[PDB]
Subunit: 323 residues, 4 copies
């Protein structure tokens, strides 16, 4: 039986102690402390001895596209750079905006900026962030020569493209250590995104296809690829930021092994609308995506606040072991 | 300037007058009244009197092309019946849903979904072979029946691909599954009959994916291309005279419809019903005015969002719009 | 075991049947159907044979202030006019805006209107509603003579004012059948509002007190009055729109009888922040405010949408019995 | 124009740099950075160098009067320690909380609150005499201890009212209870010692109300007037040089502080941390810009709202603001 007690600033600002005190502070601070424990359990299992080498715990990291628009892009890049996770799942924006950020920056704005004035100035709004139209022109100039080569390799070298194979290629092409997908392909970390056409990359494929028709992106082979990552794992953990396709696709892969061993959700969705996004971890227990003997954790919060704190208290403390 | 005033039950109970009074009641009731107005504006344009090679589609053009999107769980709910009615009577032109929203319409033709409670514990449900969807329950046997029904169809699809040159995409598969289920309770039966295409770019994310996966180890070779389906949905928008978007929930379904309409520099009419909030920067939670900034909604449109569970609001919306104009659609 | 099935509009628009189909539609539509059943159980008990006459079920109706700004003001007035509920609990805005609406209307606006331009034009925003400053000037001119008389009656006739006694007096003074509190005092329905100073009525008492000091509003006697309404009831029901003080004050009164027999919440709050507003009915079971054998219902929705539908399917169908 | 960029853990773990990077991370992380800026602006003004009969208060004026409001459940949480620290060191000037936020600070001096889970079932908890507050647990015996401690104090308050002319209000009672608990872990012990008034107009809505209720049948006569407490809080705003509002959660606490500041035609600085959303028309969920329309926030202020559980955000906020300036407050 653990008593509720917050951090006492009469001790001064001891940041490690302040973060540890979230566990006994209550409400979502306590869930944060539980999430730290669950992620550290994943890492401790992964470091147990037994293209990418198998480890004792396969960690799936999922995130919605807007988190790549945000500075959480740097947090994810760090984990991928140091081989701390094994499989990435994101929607199409979460692919393309990592690449675009290597060509031009995203800027801070406000949620309340009016769409008319923004559109008239060629500025696209993402929450309280701003992406100029010119960023996508740069993307077009960068991407079209690659699409030309991909069609050629398909038609003359027999290549059968899927979203994950295209994402590996785009990461190699961007050739920039600030990029998540640069590090992912270098470290043989696959990236799944079954609706890769739903964004700017789709715009480009669409326009490209009228001049150079025929590109195929098969989602069936990529379903086999993600499901086998779960089926042949010794143990699995899921770390899922946000909801939607990213959350369900990781969960359903883990259903194929009768459930993940560890799971942490950070998302703002609520259960009352019946949505998969808002479903509690215990819903996933009913269908076998989380094992009955797991102790999963959900933190109800904007991941832009919580995820850097979580990484500080887990992966970043064990960096030595990942090098 | 319109005064706030609620329905007066000293009039008795006239349900049409009750629903009309939402407009002057305030908060999301007022947004509901605005949504009724926007959908009726879409319908009135669609009925104005007024291609096939450009869209690579057999569906005849009308004066307003309406895109209807909905998340998968709304097909688990009774909103499945609401959507089926609109598709049955050719009241909308394009559907977008995620994979669950396809498969559970078909499964409901084989076995029912049941009422439960949100608080039922996962361990006991799992031990009893019952899967929870919010406060709904789907027995494992429903998926066994689905497997028995679907596996021969997947055999035929592979055979047609390898010897008749068929290049499958999600929308082409969904049309075939609707034809095979051959049941007037099914949304996708009516969609294929009425030449209403269904887009679902992540069609592998669900039970149909499970089945395709297992089937492929018995019968390898099925391919599902998402590139041609992007061409097909975008051309529905580009060659429209006018467009409206009616979007229930968020995620891929909402963005995919919005991005198609960006290709024509924006939708003319738009109604969102969803529970998501903007503060997390999500596309699901973004206000319609965010979409104006990137060109998916025209600057001169008057879009409407209702912040509510669509299981409550969507049947009322249909009652006051499409269902009132049924004669014009017959 | 009940199957999920929505209303089939191939039947045409049969509104009663459409509303009944919410019960088998799922998610919050099913909770709406459950709420109809729970309220009808309250009413059926109330109509069982055994200043205000006691009945077989005492119904407490609570609502946040903004719902009186809204057109739900008419819905509440109707229930109170016909003696369909027994105790009202609202915050201070929910008192004063009913009275002000008898002097001048509230108007429809938009949530996005900018505060600076509104303030410069003397327009106050309440959500997507608008109240001109002039409405409060009218209120001042109307109320100040009443405050003069209340101070006189306190100092010369021994009156000990409480919020509920002031609300009865204000209802008698407004003398207008459009007003909730006019009907409440006429029908001997008490109104509790322990923080009655938190709003425009407070502004007025404050300004009045410098010219005519001494008015006392005791909250202790009003605590005895609301608690005795629960303690001596045969059965109780709670119908609570929104959260905050209104929700807890009704619940805590019912804890004094070891719990309400029936309970329906309609509110938009979520549990994750630990708030009383967002707590599920089952939290209230732990502390004894809802009986262990009750079957309470929460609908997660804006009450401006749901409450008129709920009344249509419950109280309004039994109007004959209330006359 | 500032670029989006998150903290780079290739630097290692420097927690101050990590928190500073929230400003350029986006979404509510960016709002957190803006909140740090606004609170530090309040503090810097308060420390500028620079009545008693007008405010009927013994507290000396500073260059910025800071109002701190918080909902009751945050005193059930460990944020009680965070608030106590600010009050102990005279860093804020006025407190507003609901009744639970008073009584549970006192009860925690008698017995602890424990960690639990949101999903614990009410029937089993009730049968075991345990009350649930979110994912926290308070045994019934805590309230028994509270009763034993409080009843003699209520006896003295009635006696002082009837023979020494005392006219009790919530704030006067809260000062007395803080003096009686005589324990440096208590928020209200420090508030009365430092002449920080606490307003709680619905002080009867909770366990203190229960106790006053039962006590009154043994010892009739206690009166609690809310009119004088309205005069007292409003005069704190009217006679301020500058004001800031720091408001955790919504409800009465948020409006009561805002309405006091309306009396001076608006607060100069304002930070909200709350989880409520605007769509339901609620005051809790209203954006700061709503308060600009009615005059509670000055038109030239730059208020900030962070959409988050304060149990997560408030300790971080204090770490980067008040706790950095501790020396100036000593
Ligand atoms: N930057 C963009 O948002 C962007 C860009 C291009 C395309 N798109 C497309 O939009 C579609 C829908 O986007 P999506 O599925 O990535 O998610 P989404 O933005 O729709 O969010 C889904 C849910 O995830 C949760 N979530 C979102 N942001 C969160 C946060 N900061 N913290 C915690 N939880 C959070 C919320 O509950 C939200 O409702 C995708 O197909 C995507 O490619 C979006
Ligand atoms: N029945 C199921 O939920 C189910 C079944 C199989 C697979 N999946 C998979 O889960 C993935 C994610 O599901 P999704 O993208 O369809 O949506 P989702 O369930 O993740 O919902 C996305 C957002 O839509 C909004 N929404 C959901 N239900 C709503 C309602 N009742 N009223 C209003 N707004 C509502 C909410 O803001 C929610 O966060 C999909 O790829 C899907 O195939 C789900
Ligand atoms: N019109 C006004 O809002 C107004 C006017 C004058 C004074 N005030 C003062 O503001 C203070 C706080 O207001 P309050 O306690 O009445 O509530 P509130 O507006 O703070 O709402 C409390 C909670 O109730 C729920 N709620 C609100 N509106 C809802 C709706 N439409 N449907 C469902 N749930 C809903 C929400 O979860 C919300 O967070 C009170 O003391 C009041 O006197 C407000
Ligand atoms: N511990 C308790 O909760 C408790 C104890 C005794 C009595 N009560 C009574 O309940 C009544 C209502 O409680 P209240 O008005 O203090 O608030 P509440 O708990 O009703 O919360 C009001 C709103 O504040 C916001 N909020 C709450 N917790 C938050 C958090 N962790 N982070 C951010 N925002 C948050 C939310 O939007 C919430 O809807 C009061 O009269 C009180 O005395 C409660």
């Amino acid at each position: 039986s653990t008593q509720v007690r917050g951090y006492d600033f009469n001790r001064g600002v001891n940041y490690r102690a302040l973060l540890e005190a979230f566990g006994t502070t209550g409400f979502q601070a306590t869930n944060f402390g539980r999430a730290v424990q669950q992620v550290n359990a994943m890492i401790e299992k992964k470091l147990e001895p037994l293209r990418r080498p198998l480890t004792s715990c396969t960690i799936f990291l999922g995130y919605t596209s807007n988190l790549i628009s945000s500075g959480i892009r740097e947090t994810i890049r760090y984990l991928v750079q140091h081989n701390m996770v094994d499989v990435l799942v994101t929607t199409a924006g979460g692919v393309e905006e990592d690449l675009i950020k290597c060509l031009a920056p995203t800027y801070l704005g406000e949620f309340s900026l009016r769409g008319k004035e923004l559109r008239e100035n060629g500025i696209n709004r993402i929450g309280n962030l701003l992406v100029p139209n010119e960023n996508y022109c740069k993307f077009e100039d960068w991407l079209m020569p690659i699409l030309d080569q991909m069609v050629m390799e398909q038609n003359t070298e027999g290549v059968k493209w899927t979203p994950s194979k295209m994402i590996a290629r785009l990461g190699k092409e961007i050739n920039n250590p600030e990029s998540v997908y640069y590090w992912a392909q270098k470290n043989h970390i696959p990236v799944f995104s079954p609706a890769l056409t739903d964004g700017s990359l789709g715009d480009m494929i669409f326009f490209h296809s009228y001049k150079n028709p025929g590109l195929v992106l098969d989602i069936v082979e990529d379903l086999r690829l993600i499901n086998t990552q779960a089926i042949f794992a010794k143990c699995t953990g899921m770390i899922i930021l946000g909801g939607g396709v990213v959350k369900h696709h990781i969960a359903n892969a883990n259903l194929m092994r009768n459930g993940a061993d560890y799971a942490v959700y950070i998302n703002t969705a609520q259960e009352f609308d019946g949505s998969d996004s808002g479903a509690r971890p215990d819903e996933a227990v009913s269908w076998g995506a989380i094992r009955v003997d797991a102790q999963p954790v959900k933190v109800y919060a904007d991941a832009s606040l919580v995820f850097p704190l979580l990484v500080a208290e887990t992966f970043a403390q064990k960096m030595d072991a990942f090098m």
